Symmetry: C3
């Protein structure tokens, strides 16, 4: 047993609070392999490897049939870290023994795993074996937040629709439904947003979250400048690019003000472009333009010193800016490893630089971003092996820290910081 494996074993014992997921609290764990293999990580990759979208997303085939088809394309993917998560979770959760998933062994695994997951206490078994105490949700702004344990599945207000999509009649309607306000004037939109916050806070929300395009640049926007764009949206007109920009800035800034008023952190996921690949599988269409800078957010950071902004960056090149900005701005926090940057090749240097330059209390190591509970463990395990390596190399060896001291840093990054950064409203 190598020193790194031992340090990792210590990290493995740490019970976690996942500060960011897309779990459906009403259907948190999977019911069959289709919930796992049918998830976009794999369908986008099967597709990317040459499987027609039509084959994967064929109308009116069973979940099991769909899994069969995807498996046929797994041979092109057996090198990916994504497929490694899959084999490791299957072995952990289902007792899967083979080193790879093939057209010859998939069905027996499907049938078997399905039985295991029909057990009444399946969700609890996953949480238990994944060292998860609690998971942050990403709730739609109109989510009733009822029907589940808000202390285990912790609400977070997703604001993307309000900030970027008031242009859409369906978005306005949902807002009207949720708040009862006619939000065609700034004062009323502000009232509406205020009601969403009170609603989220009263159900134990611990954060707001948003995904932002690389071009976004927040500024203050007065009510007068907001009123034309907002009136156009509600009158049903198509907003010009400038109107749309002004309105999104108005909404975004208003949300940051409510975060300050309610002492909520505002998670910013920066750098994503939606629907770059127009013919991709469901949830496999978003990419990014790397040409972004946190400098674009200087007005926000300066204007809201009492709002913590846990920031994830999509582009790997952006990490070093994030380090410098978390290093200087007391309200800027480095938050996990997001999406396309969420692989060992990029995690290691990112995790490494953050631990050595950012204060230890401004560093959230990791979140799962999972849609089903079973994906939590393999991704957190991947992160723990990387973290164990950095801790051992740079702290145990580099600084002569005891394993204990190094593991204590590990615990703060995985868990301690989540507790103090997201203390509750």
């Amino acid at each position: 047993s190598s020193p790194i494996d031992q340090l990792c074993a210590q990290l493995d014992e740490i019970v976690l609070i996942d500060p960011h997921s897309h779990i459906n609290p009403h259907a948190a764990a999977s019911k069959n392999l289709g919930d796992i293999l049918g998830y976009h990580y794999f369908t986008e990759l099967a597709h990317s490897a040459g499987m027609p979208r039509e084959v994967i997303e064929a109308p009116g085939i069973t979940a099991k049939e769909k899994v069969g088809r995807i498996v046929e394309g797994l041979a092109h993917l057996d090198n990916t870290i994504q497929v490694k998560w899959l084999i490791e979770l299957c072995e952990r959760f289902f007792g899967f023994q083979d080193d790879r998933l093939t057209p010859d062994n998939w069905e027996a695994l499907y049938d078997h795993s399905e039985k295991l997951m029909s057990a009444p206490d399946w969700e609890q078994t996953v949480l238990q074996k994944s060292q998860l105490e609690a998971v942050f949700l990403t709730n739609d702004f109109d989510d009733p937040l009822t029907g589940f344990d808000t202390k285990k599945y912790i609400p977070c207000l997703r604001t993307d629709d309000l900030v970027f999509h008031l242009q859409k009649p369906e978005v306005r309607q949902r807002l009207a439904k949720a708040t009862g306000f006619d939000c065609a004037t700034p004062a009323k939109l502000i009232h509406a947003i205020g009601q969403l916050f009170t609603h989220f806070v009263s159900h134990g929300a611990k954060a707001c979250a948003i995904s932002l395009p690389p071009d976004f640049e927040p500024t203050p926007v007065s009510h007068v400048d907001a009123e034309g764009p907002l009136r156009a949206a509600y009158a049903g007109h198509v907003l010009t690019t400038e109107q749309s920009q002004i309105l999104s800035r108005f909404v975004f800034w208003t949300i940051a003000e409510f975060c300050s008023e309610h002492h909520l952190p505002f998670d910013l996921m920066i750098g994503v472009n939606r629907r770059v690949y127009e013919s991709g599988v469901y949830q496999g269409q978003d990419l990014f333009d790397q040409r972004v800078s946190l400098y674009q957010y200087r007005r926000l950071f300066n204007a809201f010193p009492r709002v913590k902004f846990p920031i994830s960056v999509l582009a790997h090149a952006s990490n070093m800016e994030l380090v410098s900005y978390a290093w200087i701005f007391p309200n800027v926090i480095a938050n996990g490893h997001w999406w396309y940057s969420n692989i060992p090749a990029f995690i290691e240097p990112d995790c490494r630089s953050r631990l050595e330059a950012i204060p230890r209390n401004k560093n959230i190591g990791y979140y799962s971003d999972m849609y089903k509970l079973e994906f939590g463990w393999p991704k957190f395990q991947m992160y723990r092996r990387v973290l164990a390596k950095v801790l051992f190399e740079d702290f145990v060896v580099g600084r002569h820290w005891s394993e204990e001291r190094a593991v204590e840093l590990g615990r703060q990054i995985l868990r301690g910081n989540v507790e103090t950064i997201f203390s509750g409203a």
Copy 2:
């Protein structure tokens, strides 16, 4: 001995199809050290280290004399990977026993190597000693493609002149001569390009290739929009920036249409600026503005689902974008390590990230970009050592793959994908 070495030894034995080079099939190998040491890899560095251009490119000196002068400036270069290629090549092909080329040992090498290279079968000896089975060319659009084995030296259509240089009188003349068309109208220019494709397909061509500046952003261009700029070019006008951009887009898009029709992949080398250093040696003047994104190619990737785009990026920071785009677009392939990115410090993390996140069938390991055959081996060997390292660490160790399974991955990256991606028209 070393586990990495053993894995490298197995990769060394894989016979290659070099998927991108600038070989002249009628003068494929060198005749003297002037063809080697006088190549821009070494003159640009000697000049960079402080040797005057006027000394290196003095008119009325022989190849041997020029070699002599470059050698004087090599003491400043013994650290460089480029000079490692040079020494290794000399050891392999010329029996060179010294650790470096110096004023006191170069002449003996020059006379001995020139003697070896004058041998009738030198070309064949190099290919055999390089594990090279076939090599892609990059031919001018008017290359007759005649007089050589097109299965050994495989034609590829170089499109740079058509896309960016119709402003040059001589380019228009060459195109008129080659196609018989009067391309001053859009429709005719399209037919002309079609005839270039027919010519190349008749000679077993396997791809198109182009190098692109950072500002290039492909979009469709209508005949009405193209007619203005095209007429101006054929009228001997100096095109405005916008005219030039419209014409280049029109030609580029037209070419991709033909790639789709003939089932030819379109190799894109993205991000070069020509003549950044205006007083540099021949072929040592180009650099780059790293402020580019594959996002600017989204229209292209979406509009040509049946064209494979093997992409190379110049800036190291663009690699992470490349891995993401090859991850999502079925038709985006990661293609080798280009130019300034073609050194171990950058190749390793780029090679590493590609293997772990991109499907194994969308990853072309390496091409030589060589101008003379002797440069193929040292460059490929540098690559094999990095890949061996990545395979051992991330697959053999990281995933508990057997050496065999890892070598099989390596073989696919080095050779297998070249066969499937460039199958022929």
Copy 3:
């Protein structure tokens, strides 16, 4: 015979440690080069910006009428949040080497005893000498104000470099114009007079052993030549006491910058460019803890400069890690582009290693300046250089000793050239 706890990398580092250095860039005040107490070390922005970033209010740190000892005490209270940082590693190692500090960390429990002891040590008549000797420093390049007389200190020990930022960016300021007028004796209201005045500064610095000009530049800066005619308006406006529009300001800056390059050309002086800083991005930070950057830059915007001045060496530091690869490429092609150390936010092991690694394998060995301290006080030199030597030792052993089968001696020689040799040949003097 070797210590068992010593790796081959440690052995290589040990040989690097014995290289007597000339620091090619600092901000030492030659009249107060070393610290008098921990207030000088702990009170420096490395630690105050971090303490503040970790949650300590600036009002607490920068409270008026608080002694240096009390300020240290307050900063120590907040070091718990920082014991992971490389900056804190510098501190501990610093205190160990100079003050005999034996503890693995600095806490409220043990700081006062260290403060007291270190203040006694630093009050020794030969403290400055002691630090230099223990730091393997032979000489240090200063960054002098343009109006420094360069006569109040030993210029062979503290080597003058002309700080140009104020001339290039701040003629808008009455205080800068007045200092220039006092220094040179000129009404620089006209381009010709201003050039002559700048010329006198050069003549003054060169005759006092100056080895470089230096400047920090913002990401938007794009040097081009500027005619006297184009410059006369903005210059006149600055001297009239007017407020320069953005355009006047940018023209004037380009003009002064290009002028300075021209003098560098004339005197064969290298011009250190530190590229990529934005001032006062964080508006409520601690003193010297407000500047950040915008990564969206390219050396491509400097192309005119590099092309127009082949006889000027431009040692370049890039602020953003992403820009390093572009620097490697430009140093690789332009004879007059030189890679210069690891600057500011890039000055941490996680970034130094790949940046150092790529420079060694692609840039000619004579165009690579390994490191400078940027130090404000002498005690910061050693821990930062030691941090660097450790990275360099790793790179040298892995890529040269193992990678190219070099003897350790040959690898160390490359190390010596990078640390010291290139400093001597790049900054030989006018």
